[PDB]
């Protein structure tokens, strides 16, 4: 209540305080407890193999230099006091670019407790690397992580833990990606060894299952409709050479434009994806429909009955063998 | 000041505003001066100010030319008026099931970062008149139907925090979409019917009309969904384009049926073309009536 008394108490905490020295310097490691409250996952990029996360990142530790008596309150202090305190050197090892939000002030909290416990909160947006396996794309499941580490302090000086264990991370239900569902999240803790020593690590991982619906509408259905269009040729008189070759050309070339367009939406991977396998199958069907007409055109003068029979056969065999192709494909990948 | 942009692809909007905070700090009370003191902006760095933030912002800044766009006005009783000019890109999750005949609700969520309701309380100063300049908003693609001001407390693991919400209802203007997508689709569908007046012996001509209209309707569909986020559901415009696709595909199958029978059954073939000339335009008119009644 007496603000001069609180000012005196806080001035005494910071008098002769050395920001250069971690709590218990030269003694047992300082234990830092971590909480995260997920605000959003804004974007997931196959092209850049990364995702953008916004979170409230909370660190808890004890600094006995900040212990205070005669005030039965937790002190919430203006954010700018963080610049006068030691704080952990925590970083995100797989981040590409991160920032702390800055409006209307730096999005930072400091809450002190009488025993010298510090609660330090930051609101962070991070773009973090997620290497993706696109062999089953777009029927794929990805594992995207956030790797949390001490930059310069080894496990002699600092230890990390998930504060609350498996409840340390909240807000996974807030994640609203149109193209993905979050199947599961996991929290891991370990030590990592480098040439400069052993460092504490925490890992948060997500399993992201791609939703098929966009791909049905954008690629699969158009490819199916072009393949069906190619079969119209088999009901057209074999003397209609311009009409049947036009159907053949337009379907073959449309199937090439769909293929080349698709791979411009993805990174330059050297392997075949599931959707590439579908488009390559559809290509073979529409190419064979044109070769069927070439065969009919070539023989119908000399052998008009054989030519007629091949068109009749094609009307059943193309739809049947495309149905078989689809059955095998969608069983293998779903 | 403005809403510069609304993005369906990024599900966000960009707002520029003058953000004013009023509070009393009795440490700043002064006597013997019957004036309100406007001080150079740089004094804000020597004062306590609230830790206010925008919970759904993606990226925000205070304008900085020619100085930080900030005001401090002191009053004799220790009342501080603190003003900032801010541009914020803020998240707005959109429901695109009725797009582009859709209405969206975009909010700005205002909260204390670190102070709980034990330390800080927020209110809309002037109540329902606390927000001005909604008439300035000039989005070509949207009209602002309504705005609302809400006040509540929000609970997290670290405690209860004061919240203010400003929300807008944004009604999409149809006109751009009539010109860009609906009219082209209608004109391709009408083009497909030209086939029914062409002699059935003109196989190259009638198959060309069929192919070109079917493939143009596919290019319109695929192009459209590249303007939008990768949602797994069907939008209203997708429903229109899928209907137009079925019409132009059936016009080509009509010729395939005529081509298949006109040698043996030239009278049946002639009758099917005659029927098609009335039934396609009639059933497309019905389709349009049902569609535009359901969505308007």
């Amino acid at each position: 209540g007496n603000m001069s008394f609180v000012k005196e108490t806080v001035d005494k905490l910071l008098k002769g305080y050395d920001i250069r020295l971690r709590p218990d310097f030269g003694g047992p490691p300082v234990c830092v407890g971590m909480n995260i409250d997920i605000a959003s996952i804004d974007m997931v990029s196959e092209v850049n193999m990364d995702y953008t996360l916004t979170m409230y990142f909370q660190q808890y530790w004890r600094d006995k230099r900040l212990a205070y008596s005669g005030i039965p309150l937790n002190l919430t202090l203006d954010n700018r006091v963080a610049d006068q305190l030691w704080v952990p050197d925590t970083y995100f090892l797989n981040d590409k670019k991160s920032f702390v939000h800055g409006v209307t002030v730096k999005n930072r909290m400091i809450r002190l407790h009488p025993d010298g416990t510090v609660l330090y909160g930051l609101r962070i947006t991070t773009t973090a690397a997620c290497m993706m396996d696109l062999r089953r794309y777009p029927l794929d499941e990805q594992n995207c992580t956030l790797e949390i580490e001490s930059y310069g302090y080894t496990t002699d000086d600092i230890e990390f833990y998930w504060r609350g264990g498996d409840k340390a991370v909240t807000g996974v239900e807030r994640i609203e990606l149109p193209q993905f569902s979050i199947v599961e999240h996991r929290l891991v803790s370990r030590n990592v060894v480098f040439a400069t020593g052993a460092y504490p690590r925490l890992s948060l991982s997500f399993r992201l299952k791609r939703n098929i619906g966009y791909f049905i509408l954008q690629t699969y259905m158009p490819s199916i409709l072009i393949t069906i269009l190619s079969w119209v040729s088999f009901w057209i008189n074999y003397d209609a050479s311009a009409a049947r070759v036009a159907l053949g050309i337009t379907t073959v070339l449309t199937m090439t434009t769909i293929n080349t367009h698709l791979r411009e939406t993805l990174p330059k991977i050297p392997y075949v994806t599931a959707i590439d396998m579908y488009l390559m199958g559809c290509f073979v069907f529409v190419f064979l429909a044109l070769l069927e007409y070439a065969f009919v055109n070539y023989i119908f003068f000399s052998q008009p009955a054989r030519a007629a029979a091949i068109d009749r056969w094609s009307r059943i065999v193309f739809p049947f063998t495309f149905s078989l192709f689809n059955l095998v494909y969608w069983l293998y990948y779903v | 000041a403005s809403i510069d942009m609304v993005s369906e692809v990024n599900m966000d909007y960009t707002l520029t505003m003058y953000f004013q905070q009023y509070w009393r700090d009795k440490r700043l009370a002064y006597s013997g001066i019957p004036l309100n003191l406007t001080l150079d902006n740089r004094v804000a760095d020597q004062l306590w100010v609230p830790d206010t933030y925008f919970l759904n912002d993606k990226k925000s800044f205070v304008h900085g030319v020619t100085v930080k766009n900030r005001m401090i006005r002191l009053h004799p009783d220790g009342t501080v008026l603190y003003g900032l000019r801010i541009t914020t890109t803020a998240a707005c999750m959109m429901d695109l099931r009725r797009y582009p005949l859709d209405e969206q609700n975009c909010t700005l969520e205002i909260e204390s970062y670190g102070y709980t309701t034990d330390d800080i309380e927020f209110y809309w100063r002037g109540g329902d008149k606390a927000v001005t300049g909604v008439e300035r908003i000039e989005l070509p693609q949207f009209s602002i139907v309504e705005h609302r001001l809400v006040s509540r407390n929000v609970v997290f693991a670290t405690g209860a925090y004061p919240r203010l919400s400003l929300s807008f209802r944004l009604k999409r203007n149809i006109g751009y979409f009539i010109l860009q997508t609906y009219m082209p689709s209608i004109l391709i569908t009408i083009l497909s019917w030209v086939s029914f007046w062409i002699n059935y012996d003109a196989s190259a001509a009638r198959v060309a009309l069929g192919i070109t209209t079917v493939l143009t309707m596919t290019t319109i569909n695929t192009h459209l969904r590249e303007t939008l986020p990768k949602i797994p559901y069907v939008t209203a415009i997708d429903m229109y384009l899928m209907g137009c696709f079925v019409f132009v595909f059936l016009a080509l199958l009509e010729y395939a049926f005529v081509n298949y029978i006109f040698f043996s059954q030239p009278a049946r073939a002639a009758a099917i073309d005659r029927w098609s000339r009335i039934v396609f335009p009639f059933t497309f008119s019905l389709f349009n009536l049902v569609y535009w009644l359901y969505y308007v």
Partner: nanobody, 108 residues
């Protein structure tokens, strides 16, 4: 004994992506049971009902259900359903929720 409570929603459910189950015993405070997202089916449970109760939904009917298996005499309360706004705070706290069902009494 196995039981299936159900919770049917109607109106602007887009603005309220989360449905929560609470329960209020006579005298005690209103208590979190679990919550489900309409979109994705992302689920969370209180420890007490973890590996006993299961929540899920169907977006077709606009319906959420609490499947109360392996019941106990501690599970005796007025069970309420509620909707949470997108930016309305933590799952666990009933004051964050806006639209409360009538509340079914359950005794065993």
């Amino acid at each position: 004994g196995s039981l299936r409570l159900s919770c049917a929603a109607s109106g602007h459910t887009f603005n309220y992506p989360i449905m929560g189950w609470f329960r209020q015993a006579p005298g005690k405070e209103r208590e979190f049971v679990g919550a489900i997202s309409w979109s994705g089916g992302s689920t969370s449970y209180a420890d007490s009902v973890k590996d006993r109760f299961t929540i899920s939904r169907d977006n077709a009917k606009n319906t959420v259900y609490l499947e109360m298996n392996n019941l106990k005499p501690e599970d005796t309360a007025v069970y309420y359903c509620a909707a949470k706004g997108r930016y309305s705070g933590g799952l666990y706290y009933p004051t964050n929720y806006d639209y409360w069902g009538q509340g079914t009494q359950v005794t065993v």
